[PDB]
Structure 1
Amino acid sequence: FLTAVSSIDTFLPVLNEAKLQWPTSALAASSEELLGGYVGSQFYLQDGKYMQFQIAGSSNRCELRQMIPDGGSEIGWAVDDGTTHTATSSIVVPEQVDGVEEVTIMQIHSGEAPQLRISWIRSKSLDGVAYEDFIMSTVRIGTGDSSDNFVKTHLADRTAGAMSFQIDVKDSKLTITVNGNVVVNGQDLSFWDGTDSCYFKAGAYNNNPTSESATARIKFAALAWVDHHH
């Protein structure tokens, strides 16, 4: 039988501050249900250690969405509220099966748009450089569709072993740290000033596959939203 993520202590803090959305943004499990042992092939404990997310289908997801702690409702914060908002993770990204092209593994999202997606990418050229099998950040600096609305950055080549990530937002600036090294330093988020509906997400969100049957799979060794106010 499939072992539940809540059967160990590692993820209890974030599970107390998240709902699970699967296979769309519809609710799969409340925070209470997650802490109570919700489990399925889409969301189970792998190797006695990893919170594993799986999903197939274009734009489908198996993803945690930040909630107010202790059974609270959906959280919303602003990039310019003066507080540091922080998400940390340690992720084992396995080799992805054929047909999977991009898997978003962490986000800052609002009621209308993704401010930031950290994603695994099979193959893409950025600023005239081709990259394969890598982790990318995609930041929106507008709501348009043209390339001027995005800043897309190679963060790191995918590693077989766990890779640590940290996202920090303070005073309308974004920092991304990968394996302890700052890769994105003070990216401007001021376009989003006054948007009070931002929140963190993490898991597996499957983007532009070439087969809707192909199952994305992502293993978290750690995940937390870090409250700077205690």
Structure 2
Amino acid sequence: FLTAVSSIDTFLPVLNEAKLQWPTSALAASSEELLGGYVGSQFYLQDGKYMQFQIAGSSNRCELRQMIPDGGSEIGWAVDDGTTHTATSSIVVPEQVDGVEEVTIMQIHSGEAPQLRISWIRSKSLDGVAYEDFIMSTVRIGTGDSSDNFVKTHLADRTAGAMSFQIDVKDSKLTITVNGNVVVNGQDLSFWDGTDSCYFKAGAFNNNPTSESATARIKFAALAWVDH
């Protein structure tokens, strides 16, 4: 069998606060299953150190979904409870195979929609400017589909080496730090005031592929979800 992610110590904190959704939003593994050696080609320990996610198909996923710690049920929190909700990661985004066009690697999501997606995208115009092979944040400030519902940002060009991300939510404001540099500073999340169902996700969620068989692949050297 492939080497289980839980066979080393590095990811036990987040696995203790997560369920795995694969290949859809349906449950693949409970937190205890993840802590107890759940493994497959979709989710395995890579190079002896990376929690790697693989998924093919339009809107299919291999994603960790934040849970109440120590075997609890699905968590939900508010963007303005006065604390800081923080997701931190270190991610190696390899060159994606042909047919893979956008891969969501971290999210904030609620009962209704994604407040935030951090995704790799092959090519995209943002605010009149073309970018290629880069990491993007997409923030919802509305629930519609038109441009004004989103704030989209070039976070960084994709690197060969590990890229660190810190997502901070405090007092209805979102900060994203990339390789130690603040890139998004205090994006307004006020539209979500009143919502108590937010949670982190991370892994690989495949968006608008050109081929249903092309497999997205994302490696995490680190991932943690904390409340301060």
Does the residue aligned with 1:161 lie in a helix, a strand or coil? coil
Does the residue aligned with 2:32 lie in a helix, a strand or coil? helix
5+ residue gaps in structure 2?
A: none
Rounded to whole Å, the distance in 2 between the matches of 1:32 and 1:176 is 30
Cα deviation digits, residues 85-128 of structure 1 (max 9, x gap): 00000000000000000000000000110000000000000011
Rounded to whole Å, the distance in 1 between the matches of 2:167 and 2:83 is 13
Rounded to whole Å, the distance in 2 between the matches of 1:15 and 1:154 is 29
Rounded to whole Å, the distance in 2 between the matches of 1:35 and 1:2 is 15
Q: Which residue of 1 aligns with 2:18?
A: 18
Cα deviation digits, residues 11-56 of structure 1 (max 9, x gap): 0000000000000000000000000000000000000000000000
The Cα shift of 1:188 comes to 0.2
Rounded to whole Å, the distance in 2 between the matches of 1:172 and 1:180 is 22
Rounded to whole Å, the distance in 1 between the matches of 2:26 and 2:82 is 31
The Cα shift of 1:80 comes to 1.2
Rounded to whole Å, the distance in 2 between the matches of 1:209 and 1:113 is 20
Does the residue aligned with 1:34 lie in a helix, a strand or coil? helix
The Cα shift of 1:81 comes to 1.1
The Cα shift of 1:226 comes to 1.9
Q: Which residue of 2 aligns with 1:154?
A: 154
The Cα shift of 1:83 comes to 1.1
Cα deviation digits, residues 102-160 of structure 1 (max 9, x gap): 00000000011000000000000001110000000000000011000000000000000
Is 1:45 the counterpart of 2:70 in the alignment? no
- Please provide the CA RMSD for this pair: 0.6
Does the residue aligned with 1:9 lie in a helix, a strand or coil? coil
Rounded to whole Å, the distance in 1 between the matches of 2:216 and 2:21 is 15
Does the residue aligned with 1:112 lie in a helix, a strand or coil? coil
Aligned pairs, how many? 228
Q: Which residue of 2 aligns with 1:199?
A: 199
Cα deviation digits, residues 49-81 of structure 1 (max 9, x gap): 000000000000000000000000000001011
Q: Which residue of 1 aligns with 2:129?
A: 129
The Cα shift of 1:82 comes to 1.1
- Poorly superposed stretches of 4+, deviation over 2 Å: none
